[PDB]
Design a protein around this ligand. Structure first.
Ligand SMILES: N#Cc1c(N)n(Cc2ccccc2)c2ccc(Oc3ccc(NC(=O)CN)cc3)cc12
Ligand SMILES: N#Cc1c(N)n(Cc2ccccc2)c2ccc(Oc3ccc(NC(=O)CN)cc3)cc12
Ligand SMILES: O=P(O)(O)OC[C@H]1O[C@](O)(CO)[C@@H](O)[C@@H]1O
Ligand SMILES: O=P(O)(O)OC[C@H]1O[C@](O)(CO)[C@@H](O)[C@@H]1O
Lengths: 439, 439
């Protein structure tokens, strides 16, 4: 009794499945965005979706405006958003219902876990309809409202991401700004904010007040909602830069050996000096420096003459029994293991070691702290860097083990208009190449 | 250049410190509890302190009532708490100032990081005085207010932990309840709740409303405050049971070998059956079962015929190079390593392996999820179990590696009146002993 087998790829112990002659084969969530236009609802939707997908929760944004741009060919003006525009009001409702139809298909038929319903959802009527849709489909509903009265914040959002919208292609900055202000005004009369005190007392919600200065949290039901709330409380919209790089070339790199805790080669030491000059030239008022607990990243940070913090979570992927071996020695000693990894690089777990999937779980606290911080330099390792980069660049689990993260190269990340601007800076020091493409 | 040495105990790479001829050698936080008596302030203080200490943040509670019980020998009645009691009002202020004096000494001179100031702090005047004390000593201030108007909740708190207070030793349940209600009334007139809208807008605070049904979060400044907020949102006061046990005896246990991924011995399989009978006899409506990804815990869970979830975070401490070795083989092959561990069992890191300190960091998400859940059975390993037990039993880092966690024994944890009631249930199946006392 209790016969188990270890799955070849993930190394998970499962009950031996001696299928008979005829082999026979929790609740999803609708995140409801709430608020007036230019309140960062799309910014929240996109960032939260990026984080949830990276941690392994399949998430998708359903933006009602995109359904509208598809149904109504060319956008002319705020007149489309008028409350007295009978025809456009019918079209807008149809677009919201078509988005909900795609929400049902995503959560009930496509293996999606979270659907972010990105719309104004400013009226109790619209929200009651979304709740009815959730209850009838056995979906949980979690509301995220963004409340802000600052005209500087509103004007800045219009200038940064609204004027550049496909709706304002034929318009100049002044026309687009004026039209958008009138467009916001169309929503102000019927806007009923969330009321957790009386009306929305039984709803699970978060009210993000004054661009995250204050929060009203009501009835957090589960793990995922609690995580979202913690995430929203850790992120900020302050300007900053994230620099990511690997340790300078090490002795194992020269021998083509994986893992281990070898020190910097002569070229690696040259990169470390080059990195110090680069850091100095960036003229950053304050900079946090993070390393792994492995020698090569610490030696690189030592060259900076700056305080640094060592994180065990930043240590390179653990290769288990394959540690300190070359890829040729892995193919010759463990050919089955080598081929299994090549076929499923993200989920593959090394024997007594890790997978890229395990790395994500380990790096989640790193990501949360990266979000809290401002200027940060992370000196790490190839697999760790691919994982962090997949988070910032919204790369899938399938692409993550193949992202190009060369040695002696700084990846400069600048958060701007929904995404991250990525600049690469090679510090002109030769090294070996450790990148291996798929087969 | 960049000469580093690896510290023998923790295995941390540090710059080689060639001290010259004459060798030369962030801000603490005051957590302010706010609210009327019988609002769970002491419950919050104690639980939060237990969590913060376990994760490695030195934390201490300063309860003003304990300073009062020390200054004023015997407690007679609510008359001591009267606003017109000039003498007792002076004494109570002196007690609060004496507690603050000990807060300053703890944070500035004893290496304490967090001081939980456990008092009513119901008036703006008292809170302004605490803020002045924090600003002058360069301490951060974070307010935690508990607001509840439910008379059932208040009466239940008086019955559960107030009537049994050293103040009510000579009183019967009815006298003590009546005196305590009058005592609460003494505070109601001068009570000024936190106002993050106008008056307390610049204060860093959390308002816990209706026993954690709702939260008002204002100006979370840093990492530790964000963590506290996340913790408060994950804990609950619902009745439940936590069962903790190790996998049934394995083949490595019989050989006296550490680590590895061996399967259950014949006795281990007998324990697994005994555990199923025990679980069945507990008659729990719902029960979550958690295991590690190691075979022995999964085989134990397989005997239950219940759904279970495997956590890589529950995997036994990694012994690095010492994996699959007996303690005799460790002492003979690695005598320096063996002696270093015996001297500093909590901080000692195995080469390419872990410390109990690393285990805590790995187990933090397990603890957070254990808090969210109700009835949970955790089937794990000796070092993992000691770490989890140290959290629930408020054991120090020094005691943690020596806690007794025998094989074939269930530790039944029942949360009641500030602590955890611990019941041990041996399932009458023989095994080897893996416990090793200090030398
Ligand atoms: N109202 C409004 C908002 C707005 N205009 N934006 C766009 C924006 C982009 C880049 C820079 C500034 C604003 C936002 C971007 C995000 C946003 O929601 C937030 C903002 C901040 C937090 N949390 C915190 O800041 C707590 N440390 C959580 C959610 C609100 C707005
Ligand atoms: N008012 C009041 C409270 C009160 N009487 N107690 C004592 C208590 C002990 C055991 C059982 C029930 C209540 C409390 C114990 C804790 C407490 O503060 C909480 C309560 C709940 C949370 N969070 C959540 O429940 C969110 N899942 C965070 C903090 C408030 C009270
Ligand atoms: O997943 P991949 O492509 O093998 O890359 C990860 C490897 O890269 C290295 O960082 C350097 O080759 C190794 O230490 C690690 O095993
Ligand atoms: O810290 P200690 O006392 O060595 O106990 C941890 C050890 O106990 C075991 O779980 C069983 O002996 C080992 O796998 C592990 O190395």
């Amino acid at each position: 009794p209790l016969e188990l087998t270890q799955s070849r790829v993930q190394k998970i112990w499962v009950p031996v499945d001696h299928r008979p002659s005829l082999p026979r084969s929790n609740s999803p969530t609708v995140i409801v965005m709430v608020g007036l236009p230019a309140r960062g609802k799309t910014y929240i939707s996109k960032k939260l979706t990026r984080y949830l997908n990276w941690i392994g929760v399949p998430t998708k944004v359903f933006n009602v405006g995109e359904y509208r741009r598809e149904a109504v060919k060319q956008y002319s003006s705020y007149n489309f958003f008028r409350p007295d525009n009978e025809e456009a009001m019918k079209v807008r409702k149809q677009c919201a219902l078509a988005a909900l139809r795609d929400v049902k298909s995503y959560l009930a038929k496509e293996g999606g876990q979270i659907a972010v319903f990105d719309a104004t959802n400013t009226t109790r009527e619209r929200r009651h309809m979304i709740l009815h849709f959730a209850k009838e489909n056995d979906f949980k509903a979690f509301f995220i409202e963004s409340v802000c009265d600052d005209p500087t914040v509103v004007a800045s959002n219009i200038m940064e991401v609204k004027i550049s919208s496909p709706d304002y292609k034929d318009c100049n900055s002044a026309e687009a700004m004026d039209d958008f202000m009138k467009r916001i005004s169309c929503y102000e009369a019927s806007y009923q904010p969330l009321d957790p005190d009386k009306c929305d007392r039984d709803l699970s919600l978060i009210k993000v007040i004054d661009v995250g200065r204050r929060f009203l949290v009501n009835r957090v039901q589960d793990h995922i909602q609690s995580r979202i709330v913690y995430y929203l409380m850790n992120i900020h919209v302050q300007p900053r830069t994230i620099y990511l790089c690997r340790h300078g070339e090490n002795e194992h790199n020269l021998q083509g050996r994986i893992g281990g805790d070898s020190g910097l080669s002569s070229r690696g030491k040259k990169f470390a000096s080059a990195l110090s000059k680069f850091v100095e030239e960036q003229n950053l008022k304050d900079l946090r420096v993070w390393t792994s607990q492995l020698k090569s990243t610490i030696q690189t940070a030592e060259a900076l003459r700056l305080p640094y913090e060592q994180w065990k979570a930043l240590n390179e992927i653990d290769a288990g029994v394959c540690e300190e071996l070359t890829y040729e020695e892995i193919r010759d000693t463990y050919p089955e293991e080598y081929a299994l990894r090549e076929q499923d690089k993200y989920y593959y777990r090394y024997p007594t070691g890790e997978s890229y999937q395990d790395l994500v779980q380990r790096l989640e606290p790193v990501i949360m702290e990266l979000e809290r911080q401002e200027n940060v330099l992370v000196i790490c390792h190839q697999a760790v860097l691919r994982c962090l980069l997949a988070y910032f660049l919204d790369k899938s689990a399938e692409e993550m083990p193949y992202l190009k993260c060369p040695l002696h190269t700084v990846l400069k990340l600048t958060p701007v208009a929904y995404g991250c601007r990525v600049e690469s800076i090679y510090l002109n020091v030769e090294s070996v190449c450790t990148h291996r493409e798929r087969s």
